[PDB]
Amino acid sequence: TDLAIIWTNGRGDIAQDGIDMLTDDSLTTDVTISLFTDRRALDSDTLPDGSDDRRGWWGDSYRDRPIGSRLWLLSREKATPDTLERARGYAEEALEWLKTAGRVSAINVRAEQLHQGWLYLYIALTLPDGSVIPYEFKAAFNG
Amino acid sequence: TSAAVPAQAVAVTGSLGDTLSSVWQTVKDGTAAATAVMEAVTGVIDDISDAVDNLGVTQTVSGLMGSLSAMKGSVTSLINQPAMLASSLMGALSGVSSLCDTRTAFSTWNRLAQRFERRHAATAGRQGTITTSYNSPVAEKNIATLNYVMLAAAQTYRAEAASQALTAALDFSRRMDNAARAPVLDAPTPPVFESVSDIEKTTAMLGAALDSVILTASEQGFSTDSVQLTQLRLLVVADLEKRGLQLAGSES
Amino acid sequence: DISFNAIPSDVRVPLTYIEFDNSNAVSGTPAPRQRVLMFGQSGSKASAAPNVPVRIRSGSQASAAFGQGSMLALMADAFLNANRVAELWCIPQGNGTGNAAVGEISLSGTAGENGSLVTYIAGQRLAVSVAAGATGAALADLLVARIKGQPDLPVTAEVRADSGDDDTHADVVLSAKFTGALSAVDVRWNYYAGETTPYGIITAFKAASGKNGNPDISASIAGMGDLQYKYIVMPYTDEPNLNLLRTELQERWGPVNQADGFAVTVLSGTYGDISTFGVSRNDHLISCMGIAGAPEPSYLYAATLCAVASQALSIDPARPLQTLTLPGRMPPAVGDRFTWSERNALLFDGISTFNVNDGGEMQIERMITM
Amino acid sequence: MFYIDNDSGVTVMPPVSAQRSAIVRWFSEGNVITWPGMDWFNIVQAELLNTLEEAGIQPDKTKLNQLALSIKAIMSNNALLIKNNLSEIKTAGASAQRTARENLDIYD
Amino acid sequence: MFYIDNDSGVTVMPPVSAQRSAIVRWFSEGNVITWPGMDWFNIVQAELLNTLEEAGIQPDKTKLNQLALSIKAIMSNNALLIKNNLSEIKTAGASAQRTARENLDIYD
Amino acid sequence: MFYIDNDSGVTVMPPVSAQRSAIVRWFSEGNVITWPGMDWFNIVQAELLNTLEEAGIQPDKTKLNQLALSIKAIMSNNALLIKNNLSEIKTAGASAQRTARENLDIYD
Amino acid sequence: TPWQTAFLQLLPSGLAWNKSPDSKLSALAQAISDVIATAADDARQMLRERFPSTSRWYLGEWESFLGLPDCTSENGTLSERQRAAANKMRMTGNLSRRFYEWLAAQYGFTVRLTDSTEGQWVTQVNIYGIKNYRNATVLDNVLTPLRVYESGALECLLEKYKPAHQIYKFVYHD
Amino acid sequence: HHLPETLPAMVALYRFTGNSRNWQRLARRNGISNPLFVPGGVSIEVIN
Amino acid sequence: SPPTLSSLIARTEQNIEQRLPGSWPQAREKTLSAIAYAQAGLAAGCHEHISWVGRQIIPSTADEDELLE
Amino acid sequence: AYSPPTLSSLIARTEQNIEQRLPGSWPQAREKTLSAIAYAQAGLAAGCHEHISWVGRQIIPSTADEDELLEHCRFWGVRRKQATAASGPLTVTTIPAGTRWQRADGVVYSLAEITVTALAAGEAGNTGENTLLTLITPVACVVSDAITVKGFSGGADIESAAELLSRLEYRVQYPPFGGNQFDYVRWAREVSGVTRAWC
C-alpha cells in the first residue's frame, strides 16, 4: 500500500488524507507511473527538442528495468496518422511488462484524434479473476 | 532470502562476542563488585545448564554438561580475562545449538530467550534507586552488557531455527509427488509452524522482539551490534513472509 | 557556390583553389531562402555606416565590423552559434539619449579564508581567486584587470579608492559601450549552488537612476530595401518604434506588396508591466516573450529565440514550437519564475511564455502572436 | 549604535547553521546548563534591525524608543487612519474612489 | 528556528520565578556583578515567538525579517489597508456593507 | 517582571558608551570571541519596555504575550478596525461624515 | 534549501512528478533531507574541533591529553581554557628575556624583564596594564557573571616556566 | 561537458554516459569534496 | 555524543509533522512512520561514521595506524 | 564507520525496511512510488558518507589537501613563501617613477645602469642574456629599445605543498636551543659577514 498519484492542473503529485498521505493498493499507481515518466531514449532516436539530452533515471542502472515510457518523444507533433501509430506502439511497449507477468491478461490500446488538437489514447486492460479493484479518479483543475 | 541467513547469524554472534570482549573490564578480587559479577556469570551458566539438562532427557549430553560444570567451577579465572569469558560463552551457546534437531530447536531457543529476558528486564527496570546508588558502576556495566549480549544471541539463534523449520516443512511438502498414478498395495516441522495464523503470530513476535533488541543495542553494545541485528531481521522477516505465507501462489 | 570572379584574370597557371565553410546547408542549392534582419546598436570605433544592411557570416567578422562588445555583435554571435542555415543581415543604429553611466560596485576587504569570488557582470562570470588575507583594493584591482582583459563584455571598468585604507570599500565604476534603454546590467555574485563568497568580504552594487531612450528606427526602416526578410529581431520594446515597425509590416503582408515578415522580441520586466504591454499592442506580426529575472540582457534571449524559431519553422512550418531548448541561455532564479496559473493567464494577453526543464535548460513552452 | 560596538564583533555576519530540533527549546540552568551561542544573539538583533530598516528609520544609539517609532511608522505607511478621514485613499486617484464606491455598492 | 537550536535545551520550559523587585533593574559590568539567568532569555524569546504565533507565521531559521512580516500580518488581519480599498467590509458580508453605509450616512 | 529579577540588578541604568564603529557588527566565535556586555542587554530590555509602555500596558511577569497585546492596543488606538466598520467616523461627528462623503465624491 | 534540491534532483524526472517549490513532494523532501543536513553540519564542525584553539566538544579530551588544568587556565571562561590549551600545545622556546616577554604577552598580559636591582640573577618582571576583569563571552554558560575577576594568573605561570637557575622579582606598575 | 546547474554526481554521470554505477570515479577525478554538489559552470571530465 | 536511534526516529517524525501540517506520523502501520524509520536508520549510520571520524583527533583515543602517524 | 556501506546495500536495506514496515505485502513486479523515494534516500545517504570520508581525511597534515594544510600552518605559525618578482639591470643610455619597459612577449618591467623590477612575481620574469625591451610610454630622452646585456634573475614561483609540509614538520620537531658554546658559535656565525667565530 504505497502513496497514490493524484493529477491536478495536468501534473500529478502525492496527496494527504486525514492524518497521513492517501494510500493506493491497486494497478492505478503502477499504470500512471509506467506511462508518464520519461525513460532513456535510444541512441538513434531524434529528440523533439533541439537539444542532445535524453531523459531517464539515475536508478535505471539499479532497478533491472527501464522505468517509464517513451511518450515524451511526441511532445510537438502535427495531426498525421504517423504520430497516432507511434503513440499506440509506445503505450504498448511501456505497458507490456505487465502482460509479461501475470498481473494482466490482455491489453487493447487505440489512438485517435478527437476534437481538433486532442491526442486520444484508449487503453483497456483485462485484469485476472483475483486482482483487487483498482482505484478510480479523474483529472481535476483549480485556480 | 533463505540461503543468506546463517551467514548473518554467524556475523551477529561474532560481533556480539567482540563487543563483549571489548567492553568487559577487570575488577578487584575481594570486593562486592566481584561477588556480584561472579553471581551473575554463575546464574547465566545455570540457565544454559538447565537448558542442556532439559535437552538431555532423550540424548546424551554428558560432555557438554561436564564442560559447563568446569566453566562454572573456574569462574574467578574467567572474570579477569575478558576474551576467554566471551569465547567460552559463545562456544557453549553453539554447543547447545549442536544438540538441537529441527523439531526441538525453536522450542528450546524460545525457552532460553524467555529465561534471559526475565533477567534482563529485572536488572534493567531498576535504573534510579537509593539502593542502586550503593552498587559499583563498573560492576553494573559489566552485568548489563553481559545480559544484553546473552539475550541477543538467544534471539538470533531462535530466528535462525525458525527459518530452518520453515525449510524443513517445505521439504516435507515437496516430498510427495504430483503426477497422476494408480494406487498399489504396500508392504514393507514443529506444530506451531503448520497453520497460517500461527505463522503470522510468530512473525509478529519475532519482529517486535528483534526491534526491541535493536532499540536497546542503540545504547549498550552499540555500533555494529545494532547494524547486524537490523540486517538479520530484514532477512528473517522477509524469508518468513515469502516462504511461510507463500503470498504468490495462494488464492483465497 | 564559388564565384567566377574568385580567380583573378591575371593568372593562367593551373591553380587548384580551395575553400572551407561551416554552415549546415548541405545541398548547396537555393531552397526557399530565409533572410533574417537584425536591428541593434553599435558602439564606438564601429567602422560601419549606420542604417544600411550588412551581410555577416562569422562572429569575428561581426565584431570587426561593429566593434567589440556592441549589442549587435553580441546578438549576431548568439544567433550564429544557435542557427547556421539562415542568412543574417544586420543594420546598425546610433546612440540613444541618456548618459553611459550604468553603476558602481563596492567591495570591502579582510578575507578570512582562501576561496574564489565569482561576479556575474551581464551573465558573464568572472572568477578571481581570493587568498588568505586579500583586501578590497586588491580584489577590485584583480576584477578590473579581468574586465579589461575580456573585451566581449558590454562594459568597461575603472577603479576608485576610498579614505578607509584597510577595509578599502573600493569602487569599480562601470560604463556601457552603447547608450540606450538596454544599457543596464545586472550582477548576481552567487548564482549556482556550491558557489559562495569567502567569509569576510562585503559586496554591494549601486545602479544609477537615470532614464535613457532607444534610438529611432525610421531611417533604418527606409534603408531596409525591397526584400523579403522573413524574420526581424528588433530588440526595441518601445512604443514609438513598435508603431513604425508594425506600420511597415502591415504595409507588407498585403496583396500589393508580397513580402512577409515577423518580429520576435523579449520584454524583461515585472508581471504587471508584462501583462500591460501584452494587452496594449494587439497585432499579428510580433511575438514577444516576457521574462522577469533575466541575468542576461533581453537581446540575447531575443536572438536565441529567433534562431530556434527560424530553424524549427524552416524545417517544417506546420509543427508546434512547444518543447525546444534555447541553447546556452541562463534561466532566471527559482523564485522569480512564473507559476503555472501565471503562465496560463499570460497566454491570454498575447505574451508567449517559457519554461525550465529538469536540467537548467529552458523551453519555449508556447509561442503566441499578440 | 544598536549593534555590538564593543570592538568585539565581526563586520560580516557568520552563516547560520541548519535547524537541528523541530520543537521549541527553552533555556535551563539545571540536566545540562545551556549557553546562548552566537546564533541566538545574531537572530534577535537581526530581527530588531530588520524591523527598524523596514520602517525606514536609521538606528541610533541615543534613542531608545525606535521600536515604538518603527511600529508607528509601519502604521502610518500601510494602514488607514482615523485622523485622515479616508483622505489617503482619495489622494491616490479617481480609480481608487471608483473601486471603493462600487465595492460599497454605491454606483449609478 | 528563532529558539535555541543547540543540543543544550529543554523541550518543556522551566517556570518563571516569582517577582522580587518592584523597581526596574538593569545590567552592570562593574556596583554588583550581574548574570543573565534563564528567566530573562526565556521571557524575550517567548515574547518574540508569541508575536509570531499571533501573526500566524511559523518560525523559520533561514529568514530574519519575520518580526516585520508579523507586524504587517497583524496590520492586515486587524486594520484596513490603503491598497485594499475597503475590501474587507464586502468580504465580511452584506450586513457589513449596510452598516458601513449607515455609519457614512447614506440612506435610501 | 520583564527586567532582571535575579537580585543582581541596578536601580539606576548605567550610561551607555559612545558610537565607535560606523558599520554594522555581528557576533562571532573565532578573530576574537564576542562578548555582549551590559550595553546590548540594556538596549534590548529598554526597547521592549519602551514599546510596552508606549502602547499603554504596564510590564508584568506572569503574562507572556504582551508584545502582541501592545501591537493590538496600538492598532486599536490609532487605526480603523474591521469589526468596527465605520463607527469611529460615526462618533467623530457630522463634519467627519460630510468630509468623508465629499472626498469620496458623493454629494449634490 | 540545497539539500531538498538535491533530493528532488535524485527523485525521478518525468511528467507524473511535480517538483515545483509548492508541491507535496517538495514539502516532504525538506523534512526528509533536514536530518542529513544536521549530520553534515556536525561533520563540518569536526573540522573546527580539529584544533584545541576552537574545539568545544573535545575540550575535555584536549585538556586530559595535555594535562592542561593548572594555574594558567582561568576559573571558568571557555575562551581562556581554549587559549591555555592552544598555547600549551605549541609552547616550546628558549630562556631569553625577549622570549619570556613574548610568551607573557601571548596570554594577553604585558610585562618587561628589566635588569636586577640587588644581584645579577634576580631579574625584575615589571607588569604593566594590570586588569583582573575577564568579560563573559557567548560561548560560556548562561549562569556566569558578566565579569569574572581573577588574579595571580601570570605570577605562578612565570614561576613555573622560569629558568632553573634564576629567581624572578615581580613589580606591579600602572 | 559543462553543466547547466549543479547536479548530484549520479545524475550527472547518467545524463552523459548512461551507467551511474561508477559515480565515485567522476567525483574523485574532478576533485569535488561532496559528490552531491558537482559545480555547474566549471568544466567536468566524464569518462565513457 | 551522537544521538541514539530512537532520538533520530523522533527527530525525523517531528520534521515530517512540521513540514506537513495537520499530520501525525507516529501512527502505527503507516507510510509516514515507515519513511521516518528508514530515514532514521540511514541517519544513524551516518552519525556513527561521523563519530568514527572523530575520536582520532587526539593521539590518546586514536586507532593504531593514526596513532603511529 | 571505518568503511562506508555500498549504495546497493543502502538501497536494498531501505527498500526492505519500508516494505516490511508497511501493513501490506508488495507483489513481485511493481512500480510503487515508495521505491523511488527509497532510492533517493539511499543516494542522499551515500553522498553524505562520501563527504564524511573527505572530512576525515583532513584531520592530519600528512594527508590533508592544500587548503586545509594552509589552516594547519596558520594554527602552527608557519608562513608561506610567496612569489618573488624578477629584477635586474636594464642597459639603456643616451624619468618618472612609473616608467615601464615592455618585453617582446608582453610582460612589463617597471622602475622603482638602472636595476628594474618585473611587475609580475612569477618565473616568467626570468629571461636569458641579450634580450631587448621596448618602452610603452615615451620619455623623450632616450630611444625606446634597450639591450639588457645580462639577463634578469630571481623570479621564483609560490611555495609548493610538499615543501610547506616539510617546513611545518621541522617547526614542530626542532628542539629548544639554550646557552652553549656551540650555540653561541652558531648564533655569532649566522650574521651576515662573519665567517669564523669562537666561544
Numbering used by the authors:
A (entry chain A): 2 to 144
B (entry chain u): 151 to 338, 383 to 446
C (entry chain x): 3 to 372
D (entry chain l), E (entry chain j), F (entry chain k): 1 to 30, 34 to 111
G (entry chain a): 4 to 177
H (entry chain s): 447 to 494
I (entry chain H): 4 to 72
J (entry chain T): 2 to 95, 101 to 118, 130 to 216
Report text from the authors:
Myophage Mu is a representative of contractile nanomachines with a simple tail baseplate. It has the capacity to infect a range of intestinal bacteria and has extensive applications in genetic engineering research. Using cryo-EM, we resolved the three-dimensional (3D) structures of the G(+) type phage Mu in both its extended state and urea-induced contracted state, the latter lacking the baseplate, at near-atomic resolutions. The structure of extended Mu can be divided into four distinct regions: the DNA-containing head, the connector complex, the tail, and the baseplate.
The baseplate was classified and reconstructed by using RELION software, generating a final resolution of 3.3 Å. The simple baseplate is comprised of eight protein components, including a hexameric tube initiator (gp43), a trimeric hub (gp44), a trimeric spike (gp45), six wedges (one BW1 gp46, two BW2 gp47, and one BW3 gp48), and six trimeric fibers (gp49 and gp50). The tube initiator protein gp43 is composed of two domains: a tube-like domain and a helix-rich domain, which are connected by a flexible loop. The tube-like domains from six copies of gp43 form a 24-stranded β-barrel hexamer, analogous to that of the tube gp40, which serves to initiate the assembly of the tail tube. It is noteworthy that the helix-rich domain comprises eight α-helixes, which extend downward and form extensive interactions with the baseplate wedges. As with myophages Milano, E217 (14), and Pam3 (13), the baseplate wedge of Mu is composed of six heterotetramers, each comprising one BW1 gp46, one BW3, and two conformers of BW2 (referred to as BW2-i and BW2-o). Moreover, the entire three-helical bundle is embedded between the helix-rich domains of two adjacent tube initiator gp43, thereby stabilizing the BWs into the baseplate. Based on our density map, we only built the atomic model for the N-terminus of protein gp49, which is anchored to the fiber docking loop (residues 133–155) of the BW3.
